Amino acid sequence: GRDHRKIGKQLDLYHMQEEAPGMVFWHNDGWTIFRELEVFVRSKLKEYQYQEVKGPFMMDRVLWEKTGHWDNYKDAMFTTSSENREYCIKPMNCPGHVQIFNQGLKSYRDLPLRMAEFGSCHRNEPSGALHGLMRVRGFTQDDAHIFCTEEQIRDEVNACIRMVYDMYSTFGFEKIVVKLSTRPDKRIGSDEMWDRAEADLAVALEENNIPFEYQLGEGAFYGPKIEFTLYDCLDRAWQCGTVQLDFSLPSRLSASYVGEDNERKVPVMIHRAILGSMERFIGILTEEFAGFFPTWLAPVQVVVMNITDSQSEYVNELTQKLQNAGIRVKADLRNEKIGFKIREHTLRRVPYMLVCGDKEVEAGKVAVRTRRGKDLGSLDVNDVIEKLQQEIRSRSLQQLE
Amino acid sequence: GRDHRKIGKQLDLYHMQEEAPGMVFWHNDGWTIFRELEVFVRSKLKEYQYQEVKGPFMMDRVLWEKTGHWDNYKDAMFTTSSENREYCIKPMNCPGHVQIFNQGLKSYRDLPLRMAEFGSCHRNEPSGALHGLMRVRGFTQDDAHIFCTEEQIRDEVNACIRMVYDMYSTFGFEKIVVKLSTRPDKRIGSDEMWDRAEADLAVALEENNIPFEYQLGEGAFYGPKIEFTLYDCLDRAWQCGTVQLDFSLPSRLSASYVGEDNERKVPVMIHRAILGSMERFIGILTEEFAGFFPTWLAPVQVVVMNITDSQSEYVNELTQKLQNAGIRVKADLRNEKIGFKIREHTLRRVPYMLVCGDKEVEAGKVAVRTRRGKDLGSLDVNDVIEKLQQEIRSRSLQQLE
Ligand SMILES: C[C@@H](O)[C@H](N)C(=O)N[C@@H](CNC(=O)CCn1cnc2cc(Cl)c(Cl)cc2c1=O)c1cccc(-c2ccc(C(F)(F)F)cc2)c1
Ligand SMILES: C[C@@H](O)[C@H](N)C(=O)N[C@@H](CNC(=O)CCn1cnc2cc(Cl)c(Cl)cc2c1=O)c1cccc(-c2ccc(C(F)(F)F)cc2)c1
Ligand SMILES: [Zn+2]
Numbered sequence: 001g002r003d004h005r006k007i008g009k010q011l012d013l014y015h016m017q018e019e020a021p022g023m024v025f026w027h028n029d030g031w032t033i034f035r036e037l038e039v040f041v042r043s044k045l046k047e048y049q050y051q052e053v054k055g056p057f058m059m060d061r062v063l064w065e066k067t068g069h070w071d072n073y074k075d076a077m078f079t080t081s082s083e084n085r086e087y088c089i090k091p092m093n094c095p096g097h098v099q100i101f102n103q104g105l106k107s108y109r110d111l112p113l114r115m116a117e118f119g120s121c122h123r124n125e126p127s128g129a130l131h132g133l134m135r136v137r138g139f140t141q142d143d144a145h146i147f148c149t150e151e152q153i154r155d156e157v158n159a160c161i162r163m164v165y166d167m168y169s170t171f172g173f174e175k176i177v178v179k180l181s182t183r184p185d186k187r188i189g190s191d192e193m194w195d196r197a198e199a200d201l202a203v204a205l206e207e208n209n210i211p212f213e214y215q216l217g218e219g220a221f222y223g224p225k226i227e228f229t230l231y232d233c234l235d236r237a238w239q240c241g242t243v244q245l246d247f248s249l250p251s252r253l254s255a256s257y258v259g260e261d262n263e264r265k266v267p268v269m270i271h272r273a274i275l276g277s278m279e280r281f282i283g284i285l286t287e288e289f290a291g292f293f294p295t296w297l298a299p300v301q302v303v304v305m306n307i308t309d310s311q312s313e314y315v316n317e318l319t320q321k322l323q324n325a326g327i328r329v330k331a332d333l334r335n336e337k338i339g340f341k342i343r344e345h346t347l348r349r350v351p352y353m354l355v356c357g358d359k360e361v362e363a364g365k366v367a368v369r370t371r372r373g374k375d376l377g378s379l380d381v382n383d384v385i386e387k388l389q390q391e392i393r394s395r396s397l398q399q400l401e
Numbered sequence: 402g403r404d405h406r407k408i409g410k411q412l413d414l415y416h417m418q419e420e421a422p423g424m425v426f427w428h429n430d431g432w433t434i435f436r437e438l439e440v441f442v443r444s445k446l447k448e449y450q451y452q453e454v455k456g457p458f459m460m461d462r463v464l465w466e467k468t469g470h471w472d473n474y475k476d477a478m479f480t481t482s483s484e485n486r487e488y489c490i491k492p493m494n495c496p497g498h499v500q501i502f503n504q505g506l507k508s509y510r511d512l513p514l515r516m517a518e519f520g521s522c523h524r525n526e527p528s529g530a531l532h533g534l535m536r537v538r539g540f541t542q543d544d545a546h547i548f549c550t551e552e553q554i555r556d557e558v559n560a561c562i563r564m565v566y567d568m569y570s571t572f573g574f575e576k577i578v579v580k581l582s583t584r585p586d587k588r589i590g591s592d593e594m595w596d597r598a599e600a601d602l603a604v605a606l607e608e609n610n611i612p613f614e615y616q617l618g619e620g621a622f623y624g625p626k627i628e629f630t631l632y633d634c635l636d637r638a639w640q641c642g643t644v645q646l647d648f649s650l651p652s653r654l655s656a657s658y659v660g661e662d663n664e665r666k667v668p669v670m671i672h673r674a675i676l677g678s679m680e681r682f683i684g685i686l687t688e689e690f691a692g693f694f695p696t697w698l699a700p701v702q703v704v705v706m707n708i709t710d711s712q713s714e715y716v717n718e719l720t721q722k723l724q725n726a727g728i729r730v731k732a733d734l735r736n737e738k739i740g741f742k743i744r745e746h747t748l749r750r751v752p753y754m755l756v757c758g759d760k761e762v763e764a765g766k767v768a769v770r771t772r773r774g775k776d777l778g779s780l781d782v783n784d785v786i787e788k789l790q791q792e793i794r795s796r797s798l799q800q801l802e
């Protein structure tokens with residue numbers, strides 16, 4: 001009903017097996033949703049002027065030791081050896097992004113440098129606590145690291161906040177709770193650096209007219225963060241978005257740029273993820289929509305179906321027209337009752353069933369039925385195709401009227 | 402000089418480092434090429450009616466023992482541990498595809514089932530034998546597995562062959578050498594099975610009029626194979642494409658389907674890759690074109706630039722029009738001589754440089770120069786966008802002549 005594990009099996013989206021705990025086998029229709037979510041995030045990366053990179057799955061333990069994560073999260077990390085050398089399977093993309101930053105001399109002119117990745121990460125999570133798409137070992141982050149000057153933090157965090165609300169609004173999430181985590185007991189740098197760092201986050205939120213609250217002392221060793229919690233239609237809370245300042249990692253991994261005064265400077269790093277885990281976010285959307293994915297996300301967006309054998313060639317032509325228009329379409333030409341076809345494709349949550357009887361063929365029209373069971377009547381083929389295209393392009397939550 | 406390592410560095414496509422031997426860091430412009438190559442393969446996967454899936458990064462050694470690969474190739478696999486269980490970092494995507502197949506009741510009607518994946522694979526290759534993008538440890542296979550009946554092998558091998566030549570021709574590779582490897586001494590199945598299997602591959606090639614040389618006795622124990630070697634402009638051989646029959650793995654991993662007789666039967670598996678390694682193929686393409694990527698592959702397709710500040714608004718408007726047309730375009734309004742700007746974009750292998758002087762603004766035109774140094778003169782903006790769109794959508798090797 002609103003259980004992603006049930007709807008997942010029903011609509012053949014994914015499965016999982018004990019041979020690979022907390023690592024998703026993505027089926028055809030599930031990978032289609034995942035890929036369309038990737039396309040959506042890429043459109044925002046372009047709109048917000050991000051680079052997109054791809055880093056390796058493993059790097060030398062020696063490199064991960066310099067990050068500080070080895071001492072604190074070695075037991076959460078998958079390791080493998082080759083030729084007397086130990087490698088970590090990446091649980092995070094940040095050190096990989098610094099390696100790309102460190103290729104070539106960097107100028108103040110290159111900042112802010114926004115580096116995004118659909119980062120395939122692995123964490124050695126306890127098998128006992130693995131739950132569907134929500135708690136996994138293998139996950140994909142809508143990740144990015146911004147390399148910038150201290151002066152650029154406010155503007156860069158401002159743009160991250162807009163991107164968060166922009167992207168959440170697409171999926172109909174308008175109730176957002178925002179928490180700013182402040183300096184912990186054990187922290188790096190002066191109290192002044194923290195005053196300015198916390199001020200930068202607070203002013204960025206203020207600039208966007210966003211009310212928030214503090215989580216006192218919950219900040220990381222290496223800087224303060226903003227966390228965003230969205231509420232689904234059941235008013236259940238999901239923490240997804242994070243904007244994390246980092247005054248540690250660049251220095252640790254010898255990241256530098258030639259300042260405007262010609263002095264070598266360490267860049268500030270901003271970690272940010274909006275959806276968080278792509279798998280978890282699909283899990284949340286599955287329950288939010290109860291399998292009724294918005295048309296732009298639907299594995300199959302349209303099924304064209306004949307009442308009798310007589311409309312088979314009209315269905316073939318219309319299916320080709322929809323295919324050419326970039327719509328994910330199937331023809332249902334089975335020797336079955338129109339009622340049987342509608343019920344089957346309604347149960348599979350296909351947004352639109354385009355029904356062709358003799359009256360539709362003769363007029364060059366099509367009868368449109370929604371998965372909600374509404375009959376929109378008979379409309380011109382080209383006018384329907386243009387409307388379906390508009391709904392998909394605009395990533396509309398709503399169907400045709 | 403056409404070294405992919407040199408071009409990769411110069412055009413900021415990728416880098417590799419000692420902390421990650423034989424594993425690629427894709428920079429913004431290299432990842433753009435990678436994704437366009439992915440987009441191309443998907444267009445073929447659709448045309449040849451392939452499902453696309455995603456399998457897990459690692460699986461229990463216990464499953465890899467059932468395949469028979471552990472006894473033979475354990476030293477060529479990366480392994481990691483969790484909760485007293487040994488996991489193999491997948492060196493191949495076949496076992497994972499069988500797991501997805503095994504989920505849900507499969508009948509004769511569901512065959513042939515064509516399952517494609519951009520499969521992230523790892524092999525523990527000696528670090529001494531690594532070089533460039535040609536011999537790596539982490540690679541992405543344009544992999545697919547076809548689950549079919551003995552009756553369907555011929556037709557399915559036929560489409561595999563058509564797809565291979567279809568794809569190699571897109572990149573201008575017409576010199577293809579083909580090898581069929583027959584019965585080894587130690588093998589499974591009857592001589593009659595091998596007679597039919599070797600005939601299926603041989604008749605498929607003969608009907609397609611593909612000259613091939615038999616590699617007598619060099620076939621795999623689990624079935625025969627076709628291997629495709631393409632030649633670049635330096636006449637260097639690259640063994641990229643494979644079609645391998647397998648009458649072993651489906652049985653070993655409990656793969657079965659309900660036949661026309663309503664009784665269970667083991668499906669025949671066809672292992673099929675065309676590009677082989679997406680990374681090696683980009684390396685070969687980089688050298689083949691010496692960085693002059695066809696327009697559809699070019700990281701940046703168009704630069705629009707002004708003579709003086711007077712044409713700045715016309716340039717920004719043309720940039721937006723080209724962007725809306727689906728073209729990777731950048732604006733160059735810098736206060737630099739036209740000869741300086743054109744040299745920078747020519748060095749970066751930008752296919753098209755669009756120059757806006759007063760005469761271009763007045764007449765609603767644009768001056769078009771190719772990176773080869775051909776001046777196509779002053780042409781109507783809309784006619785140019787249509788020509789560029791056509792060149793990109795057709796995936797033309799050639800620029801406007
Ligand atoms: C935005 C990115 O650039 C950033 N690098 C990052 O990954 N931030 C963390 C949230 N931050 C932390 O948890 C920091 C503390 N922490 C927590 N766990 C760790 C675990 C490991 Cl193995 C390592 Cl190496 C480091 C850490 C570590 O530093 C984050 C943000 C959003 C989603 C997730 C997430 C990760 C895993 C899951 C899953 F396990 F699948 F359920 C779900 C969600 C994590
Ligand atoms: C088409 C696919 O579905 C098929 N499963 C497959 O992977 N075919 C093999 C060619 N076939 C063989 O190599 C068979 C023999 N062989 C050889 N080496 C192995 C090594 C390991 Cl670790 C394992 Cl588990 C199995 C094998 C194994 O079976 C293939 C085809 C094309 C390219 C590659 C390839 C090989 C090496 C690299 C490398 F450079 F190392 F990164 C990159 C790509 C491999
Ligand atoms: Zn990070």
Ligand SMILES: [Zn+2]
Nearest residue numbers: 493494495672
């Ligand atoms: Zn295979």
